[PDB]
Design a binder for these strands. Sequence first.
DNA 1: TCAACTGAAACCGAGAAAGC
DNA 2: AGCTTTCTCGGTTTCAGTTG
Lengths: 111, 111
Amino acid sequence: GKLRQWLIDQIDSGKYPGLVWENEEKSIFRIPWKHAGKQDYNREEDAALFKAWALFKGKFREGIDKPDPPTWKTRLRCALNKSNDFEELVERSQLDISDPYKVYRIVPEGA
Amino acid sequence: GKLRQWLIDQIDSGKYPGLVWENEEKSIFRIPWKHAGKQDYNREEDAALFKAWALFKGKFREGIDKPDPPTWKTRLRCALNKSNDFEELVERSQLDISDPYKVYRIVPEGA
DNA sequence: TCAACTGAAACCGAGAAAGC
DNA sequence: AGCTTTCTCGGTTTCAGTTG
């Protein structure tokens, strides 16, 4: 399973604005989640994390495949949904604000 | 897939005035479609089918959610649009009359 | 004026399928 | 094999834009 450490690395990297830890224990984080239809939407910035997952897993090849941010978003979402390593704290997510984000908890390796 | 048999059941039920079959083969039907801004509009009657779909899918809970007929209508419209089981006969729909309705064909499961 | 309405497209959870 | 990520499906939600 690559998702757990890859995502932890992405947050720890500080390369994705808004992809940040919410506590110092590094067990809860925010992941920017902007709807791709908004005017506010900028693919280069708002799709960067989804694309990186597609690039990292080889499901998209720069220069060869047509860019498809909607598909990229679905892949990371479904991976998070089915992952036993991550749990959305849905009551804490902020999808209705100008810079929307979902909140995820990282499950301890024992549960 | 729940919409096809659910809607057939609603028509067959006869509980929704104006929600009726257009032939005896039960392959074409009418769905009352009154604009919610009209004075003629009665929520309890004109939104009953839309509400029933929202209740059936758990998208509206009495005691939890505020009544919102426009959302109920949008939900059923978009589902009909996207479903391969139903096709609007737009030339037969009557949106310009005092009791407006849309006409739908039910596509055979073989197509 | 603005609530309701719209097609199109983006989005969604879940189970099957695919992949390690 | 058993685990993790992806594909498929049947709707749902949101978008800019229109309508009554």
